[PDB]
Write an enzyme that holds these catalytic residues in place. Sequence first.
Site, PDB file in Angstrom:
ATOM      1  CB  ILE A 110      -1.001  -0.010   1.190  1.00 43.32           C
ATOM      2  CG1 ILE A 110      -1.736  -1.391   1.322  1.00 43.32           C
ATOM      3  CG2 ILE A 110      -1.975   1.181   1.091  1.00 43.32           C
ATOM      4  CD1 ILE A 110      -2.444  -1.963  -0.009  1.00 43.32           C
ATOM      5  CD  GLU A 111       3.288   4.709  -4.361  1.00 42.94           C
ATOM      6  OE1 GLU A 111       2.985   3.761  -5.117  1.00 42.94           O
ATOM      7  OE2 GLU A 111       3.952   5.700  -4.750  1.00 42.94           O
ATOM      8  CB  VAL A 112      -0.570   6.310   2.012  1.00 42.18           C
ATOM      9  CG1 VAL A 112      -1.283   7.591   2.409  1.00 42.18           C
ATOM     10  CG2 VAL A 112      -1.501   5.117   2.215  1.00 42.18           C
TER      11      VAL A 112
END
Lengths: 132, 123
Positions: A127-129
């Site tokens: 997950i890339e935020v």
Amino acid sequence: ENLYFQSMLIRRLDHIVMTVKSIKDTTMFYSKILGMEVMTFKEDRKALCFGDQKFNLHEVGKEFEPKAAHPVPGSLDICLITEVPLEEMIQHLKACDVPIEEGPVPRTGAKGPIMSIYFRDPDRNLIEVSNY
Amino acid sequence: IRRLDHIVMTVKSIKDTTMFYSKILGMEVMTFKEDRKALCFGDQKFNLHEVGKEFEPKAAHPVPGSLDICLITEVPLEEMIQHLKACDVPIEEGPVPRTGAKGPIMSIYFRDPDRNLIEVSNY
């Protein structure tokens, strides 16, 4: 002719189906870590809502048809944009004891450069935020 | 306020995937960071990587055919169906009524070259 027309017509992601070991574990994680809304639909289905999009959840061994050719937990690598300053997101993940795998780092977004942090969900999806 | 920006698609062939998405869905083939390829379709994109070529950080299991996604188009679904028929892409299911994030949608389903499930829909 129709190729040309579709080239100029805007398209957007509405949802993705995430195949998970445990819908309980995944809904708990995304609600606590990213503030996603846990929703129930079609009586027996679960989804995680955010903005105008959602993740539909399938549990391994309980998948609904039709589905991906290879529904594999941990096969997703997604980038979510948030209006929350990345520094506040980093503080939030540290508080929730979620290790930050990488970041803040510069990356390429669909609309230009972004600042990103990376972490794993319960199925080890990446997950890339990010922020614009 | 949170929105999907992009997804990484692991593919057997970047050539086959870019040709398919450009022809069938009108996605723009873009090159970035000298050699990287992406498919741009609106405010979002798919980053492509050939099997075993992506470096960390990556998904725990970068697998071709693991995606099951829904794309909204303003193109009437009847026109989409005629385009896929013309391009000899079998429609697996549809037009059928389905559930979108913001309410009911009308959908068609088909497979891409890696057998990802692609749902194309209208609000």
